Amino acid sequence: KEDSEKTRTAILLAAEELFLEKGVSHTSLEQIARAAGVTRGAVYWHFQNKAHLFNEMLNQVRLPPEQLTERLSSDPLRSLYDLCLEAVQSLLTQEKKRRILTILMQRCEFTEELREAQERNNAFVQMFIELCEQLFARDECRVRLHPGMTPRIASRALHALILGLFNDWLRDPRLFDPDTDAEHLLEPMFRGLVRDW
Amino acid sequence: DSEKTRTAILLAAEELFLEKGVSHTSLEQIARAAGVTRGAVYWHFQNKAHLFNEMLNQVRLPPEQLTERLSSDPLRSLYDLCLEAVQSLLTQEKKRRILTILMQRCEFTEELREAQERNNAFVQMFIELCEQLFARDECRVRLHPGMTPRIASRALHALILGLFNDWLRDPRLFDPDTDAEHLLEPMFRGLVRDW
Numbered sequence: 001k002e003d004s005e006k007t008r009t010a011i012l013l014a015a016e017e018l019f020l021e022k023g024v025s026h027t028s029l030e031q032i033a034r035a036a037g038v039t040r041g042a043v044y045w046h047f048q049n050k051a052h053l054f055n056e057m058l059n060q061v062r063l064p065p066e067q068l069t070e071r072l073s074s075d076p077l078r079s080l081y082d083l084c085l086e087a088v089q090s091l092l093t094q095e096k097k098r099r100i101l102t103i104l105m106q107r108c109e110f111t112e113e114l115r116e117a118q119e120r121n122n123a124f125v126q127m128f129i130e131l132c133e134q135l136f137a138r139d140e141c142r143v144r145l146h147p148g149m150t151p152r153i154a155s156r157a158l159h160a161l162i163l164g165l166f167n168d169w170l171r172d173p174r175l176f177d178p179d180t181d182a183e184h185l186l187e188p189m190f191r192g193l194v195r196d197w
Numbered sequence: 198d199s200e201k202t203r204t205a206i207l208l209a210a211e212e213l214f215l216e217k218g219v220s221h222t223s224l225e226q227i228a229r230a231a232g233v234t235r236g237a238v239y240w241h242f243q244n245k246a247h248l249f250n251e252m253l254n255q256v257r258l259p260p261e262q263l264t265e266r267l268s269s270d271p272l273r274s275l276y277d278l279c280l281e282a283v284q285s286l287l288t289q290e291k292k293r294r295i296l297t298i299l300m301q302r303c304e305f306t307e308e309l310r311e312a313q314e315r316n317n318a319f320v321q322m323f324i325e326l327c328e329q330l331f332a333r334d335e336c337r338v339r340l341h342p343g344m345t346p347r348i349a350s351r352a353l354h355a356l357i358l359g360l361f362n363d364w365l366r367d368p369r370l371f372d373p374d375t376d377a378e379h380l381l382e383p384m385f386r387g388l389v390r391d392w
Binding site for chain 1 (some may be wrong): 217218236304306341351357366367376383388
C-alpha cells in the first residue's frame with residue numbers, strides 16, 4: 001500500500017501546519033481532513049483519534065530506543081555530552097523537528113482528549129532518564145561524580161536543563177544561538193556533575 | 198464586595214482550566230461555575246487572555262521584590278531564591294495548580310497573545326536581572342573562564358524552567374523539598390569558582 005502511505009503523510013503534514021498555526025485543541029480531524037484534501041473518514045481510518053494522530057506526528061522526530069543506547073554504551077560521559085549538544089544544535093538544523101516540538105511545547109494542552117499522547121511522551125522521557133541514570137550509575141562513571149551527587153539526581157538535573165533549553169528557545173528564539181551557545185549552556189551542568197571535566 | 202467576586206471567578210477559572218484546558222473553557226462556563234453573571238466576568242476581566250494573566254499574577258513575584266532580594270552575598274541570594282522557587286512547588290498548592298495550567302493545560306494561539314507577551318516579559322525580566330547580577334564586578338570574577346553573564350543567566354533559567362516543567366508533567370521524578378538542593382548544586386558549582 002504505497003497509495004496508503006501517501007495519504008498518511010499528506011494528513012500529518014496538514015495537521016502539522018494547522019496545529020502550529022492555531023493549536024491542537026482548536027484543530028479538529030475535520031479541518032485536518034479538509035486541509036489534507038481527504039475525507040474525514042480517511043483520517044479516522046488512518047489515525048483513529050486525535051491523540052494517536054499527534055503521537056504518530058511526534059514519532060517522526062523521536063530517536064528510537066535502540067539508537068540512544070547504542071550511542072551511550074572511549075568515555076561515555078563525553079558521548080552523553082555530545083548527544084545533548086547535538087540535540088540542542090538540531091533546533092536550528094532540522095525545521096521539521098523545530099515545527100513539531102514547537103507544537104508539543106507551545107501549541108497544545110494535555111487534557112483528557114490527549115491522554116494517550118501524554119502517556120507515551122512520559123514514557124519516552126522516562127526512558128532517557130533511565131538510560132542516563134544507568135550511565136551515571138556505572139562504576140567507571142560514578143566515581144567521577146562529586147560527593148553527594150547521585151545518578152538519580154544527575155540524570156534529572158541534566159534532563160531538566162535540556163528540556164528547559166528547548167522550552168526557552170522555542171518560546172523565544174532570541175535568547176540564544178543553538179549553534180554557537182549550546183556548548184556554553186551545557187558546560188556548567190557537566191562541570192558541576194563530573195570532577196575532571 | 199468587589200474583590201470577593203474577583204477571587205470567586207479566578208478560583209472557578211483555575212478549576213476549569215485545570216480540569217479541561219483553557220481553549221475548551223469559555224467565560225460563560227467560568228461565570229456559571231463561579232455563580233456569577235457573564236457580564237460580571239467581562240466587567241472584571243475583559244477577555245480570556247487578561248483573565249489568565251491576572252490568574253498568573255496571583256503567583257508571580259513582583260519586579261521590585263525580585264531586585265530587592267538580589268541586590269552580603271547576592272550569588273547565594275540567587276541560589277536561595279531558586280531553591281525556594283523549586284521547593285514552593287510543594288508548599289503552595291495554588292501555585293502548583295496555576296503553573297500546571299500554564300505549562301500543561303494551555304496553547305498559545307492568537308486568543309492568548311496578551312498572556313504570552315506578558316509571560317515573555319516576566320521571563321525576560323528575570324533573565325535580565327540575573328545577567329546584571331553575574332555582570333557585577335564582584336560576581337563576574339567568580340565565573341569560570343569563557344563563561345559570560347549572558348550565558349549564565351540563560352543556563353540557570355533553563356534549568357529552573359526545566360525542573361518545573363519536568364516535575365509538573367511527572368511528580369514522581371523527584372521530591373522538590375529534599376532534592377532541590379542537589380538538582381541546583383551542579384549548575385551553581387559549574388558557573389562559580391569557589392562554590
